[PDB]
Design a protein around this motif. Structure first.
Motif, PDB file in Angstrom:
ATOM      1  N   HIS B   9      35.266  36.487  28.584  1.00 15.09           N
ATOM      2  CA  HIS B   9      33.817  36.434  28.475  1.00 15.09           C
ATOM      3  C   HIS B   9      33.178  37.155  29.656  1.00 15.09           C
ATOM      4  O   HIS B   9      33.295  36.717  30.800  1.00 15.09           O
ATOM      5  N   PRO B  10      32.495  38.278  29.390  1.00 16.73           N
ATOM      6  CA  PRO B  10      31.830  39.049  30.447  1.00 16.73           C
ATOM      7  C   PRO B  10      30.674  38.286  31.086  1.00 16.73           C
ATOM      8  O   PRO B  10      29.872  37.662  30.392  1.00 16.73           O
ATOM      9  N   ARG B  11      30.588  38.344  32.411  1.00 16.76           N
ATOM     10  CA  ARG B  11      29.447  37.780  33.122  1.00 16.76           C
ATOM     11  C   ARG B  11      28.180  38.551  32.760  1.00 16.76           C
ATOM     12  O   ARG B  11      28.248  39.682  32.276  1.00 16.76           O
ATOM     13  N   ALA B  12      27.025  37.936  32.997  1.00 21.26           N
ATOM     14  CA  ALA B  12      25.762  38.453  32.479  1.00 21.26           C
ATOM     15  C   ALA B  12      25.507  39.933  32.787  1.00 21.26           C
ATOM     16  O   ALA B  12      25.127  40.696  31.900  1.00 21.26           O
ATOM     17  N   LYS B  74      40.599  59.094  36.161  1.00 18.61           N
ATOM     18  CA  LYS B  74      42.017  59.139  36.519  1.00 18.61           C
ATOM     19  C   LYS B  74      42.361  58.304  37.764  1.00 18.61           C
ATOM     20  O   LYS B  74      43.526  58.229  38.169  1.00 18.61           O
ATOM     21  N   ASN B  75      41.349  57.689  38.372  1.00 19.73           N
ATOM     22  CA  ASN B  75      41.541  56.787  39.516  1.00 19.73           C
ATOM     23  C   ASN B  75      40.695  55.537  39.259  1.00 19.73           C
ATOM     24  O   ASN B  75      39.757  55.246  39.999  1.00 19.73           O
ATOM     25  N   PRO B  76      41.029  54.789  38.197  1.00 14.88           N
ATOM     26  CA  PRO B  76      40.190  53.742  37.600  1.00 14.88           C
ATOM     27  C   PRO B  76      40.130  52.433  38.379  1.00 14.88           C
ATOM     28  O   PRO B  76      39.517  51.467  37.924  1.00 14.88           O
ATOM     29  N   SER B  77      40.765  52.394  39.546  1.00 16.31           N
ATOM     30  CA  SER B  77      40.821  51.163  40.326  1.00 16.31           C
ATOM     31  C   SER B  77      39.473  50.442  40.465  1.00 16.31           C
ATOM     32  O   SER B  77      39.393  49.232  40.256  1.00 16.31           O
ATOM     33  N   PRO B  78      38.398  51.170  40.817  1.00 11.18           N
ATOM     34  CA  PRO B  78      37.084  50.529  40.978  1.00 11.18           C
ATOM     35  C   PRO B  78      36.641  49.826  39.702  1.00 11.18           C
ATOM     36  O   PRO B  78      35.937  48.812  39.742  1.00 11.18           O
ATOM     37  N   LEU B  79      37.048  50.378  38.566  1.00 14.45           N
ATOM     38  CA  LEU B  79      36.665  49.814  37.283  1.00 14.45           C
ATOM     39  C   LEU B  79      37.412  48.504  37.037  1.00 14.45           C
ATOM     40  O   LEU B  79      36.817  47.505  36.638  1.00 14.45           O
ATOM     41  N   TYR B  80      38.715  48.501  37.289  1.00 16.27           N
ATOM     42  CA  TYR B  80      39.500  47.289  37.088  1.00 16.27           C
ATOM     43  C   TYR B  80      39.119  46.197  38.081  1.00 16.27           C
ATOM     44  O   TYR B  80      39.138  45.015  37.742  1.00 16.27           O
ATOM     45  N   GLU B  81      38.767  46.584  39.305  1.00 21.05           N
ATOM     46  CA  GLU B  81      38.320  45.602  40.290  1.00 21.05           C
ATOM     47  C   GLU B  81      36.976  45.005  39.887  1.00 21.05           C
ATOM     48  O   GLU B  81      36.739  43.817  40.091  1.00 21.05           O
ATOM     49  N   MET B  82      36.104  45.828  39.312  1.00 27.16           N
ATOM     50  CA  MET B  82      34.829  45.340  38.794  1.00 27.16           C
ATOM     51  C   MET B  82      35.061  44.335  37.669  1.00 27.16           C
ATOM     52  O   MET B  82      34.420  43.285  37.620  1.00 27.16           O
ATOM     53  N   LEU B  83      35.986  44.658  36.769  1.00 27.34           N
ATOM     54  CA  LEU B  83      36.270  43.780  35.634  1.00 27.34           C
ATOM     55  C   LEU B  83      36.847  42.442  36.087  1.00 27.34           C
ATOM     56  O   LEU B  83      36.584  41.404  35.477  1.00 27.34           O
ATOM     57  N   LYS B  84      37.623  42.460  37.163  1.00 20.59           N
ATOM     58  CA  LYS B  84      38.154  41.220  37.709  1.00 20.59           C
ATOM     59  C   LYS B  84      37.026  40.326  38.216  1.00 20.59           C
ATOM     60  O   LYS B  84      37.072  39.108  38.053  1.00 20.59           O
ATOM     61  N   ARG B  85      36.004  40.933  38.812  1.00 21.21           N
ATOM     62  CA  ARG B  85      34.854  40.183  39.304  1.00 21.21           C
ATOM     63  C   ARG B  85      33.933  39.713  38.178  1.00 21.21           C
ATOM     64  O   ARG B  85      33.171  38.763  38.353  1.00 21.21           O
ATOM     65  N   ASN B  86      33.992  40.382  37.029  1.00 23.95           N
ATOM     66  CA  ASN B  86      32.985  40.179  35.989  1.00 23.95           C
ATOM     67  C   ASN B  86      33.531  39.737  34.635  1.00 23.95           C
ATOM     68  O   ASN B  86      32.824  39.802  33.630  1.00 23.95           O
ATOM     69  N   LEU B  87      34.781  39.293  34.600  1.00 21.48           N
ATOM     70  CA  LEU B  87      35.352  38.774  33.364  1.00 21.48           C
ATOM     71  C   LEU B  87      35.919  37.374  33.559  1.00 21.48           C
ATOM     72  O   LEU B  87      36.763  37.151  34.426  1.00 21.48           O
ATOM     73  N   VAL B  88      35.446  36.434  32.748  1.00 18.35           N
ATOM     74  CA  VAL B  88      36.028  35.099  32.702  1.00 18.35           C
ATOM     75  C   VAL B  88      37.133  35.068  31.654  1.00 18.35           C
ATOM     76  O   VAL B  88      36.904  35.392  30.490  1.00 18.35           O
ATOM     77  N   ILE B  89      38.331  34.680  32.074  1.00 16.31           N
ATOM     78  CA  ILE B  89      39.478  34.660  31.176  1.00 16.31           C
ATOM     79  C   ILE B  89      39.458  33.388  30.338  1.00 16.31           C
ATOM     80  O   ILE B  89      39.341  32.285  30.871  1.00 16.31           O
ATOM     81  N   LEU B  90      39.566  33.548  29.024  1.00 10.53           N
ATOM     82  CA  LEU B  90      39.529  32.408  28.117  1.00 10.53           C
ATOM     83  C   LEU B  90      40.935  32.071  27.632  1.00 10.53           C
ATOM     84  O   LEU B  90      41.865  32.843  27.949  1.00 10.53           O
TER      85      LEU B  90
END
Lengths: 14, 90
Positions: B9-12, B74-90
């Motif tokens: 579930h994505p944060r707001a 091709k260097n998506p790290s910032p994206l995955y780190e953002m998703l870690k901060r902004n995704l609640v795992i169900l």
């Protein structure tokens, strides 16, 4: 490539 | 980040961006979130016109979440780190 094509590669990976 | 079948579930702030991209759902898989982010970047034309693996997000709500002004697909790290901060795992 086009952005669509680059992102599609990234999507397929994740 | 969670596996392919795992729902999140994505944060707001993130959900808001996925909504602009046309997302109707409230619960996604990670791959679905990634699909909508790509849609969003494409719609807002944030990619560099000449070198299209580079995304310039410095004056966009997406840049606020990513905390960088630009990134490479091709260097998506910032994206995955953002998703870690902004995704609640169900």
């Amino acid at each position: 490539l086009t952005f669509x094509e680059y992102w599609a590669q990234x999507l397929s990976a994740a | 980040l969670p596996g392919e079948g795992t729902q999140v579930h994505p944060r707001a702030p993130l959900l808001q961006i996925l909504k602009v991209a046309g997302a109707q759902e409230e619960v996604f898989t990670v791959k679905e979130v990634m699909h909508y982010l790509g849609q969003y970047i494409m719609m807002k034309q944030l990619y560099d016109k000449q070198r299209q693996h580079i995304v310039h997000c410095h004056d966009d709500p997406l840049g606020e979440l990513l905390e960088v002004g630009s990134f490479s697909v091709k260097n998506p790290s910032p994206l995955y780190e953002m998703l870690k901060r902004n995704l609640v795992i169900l």
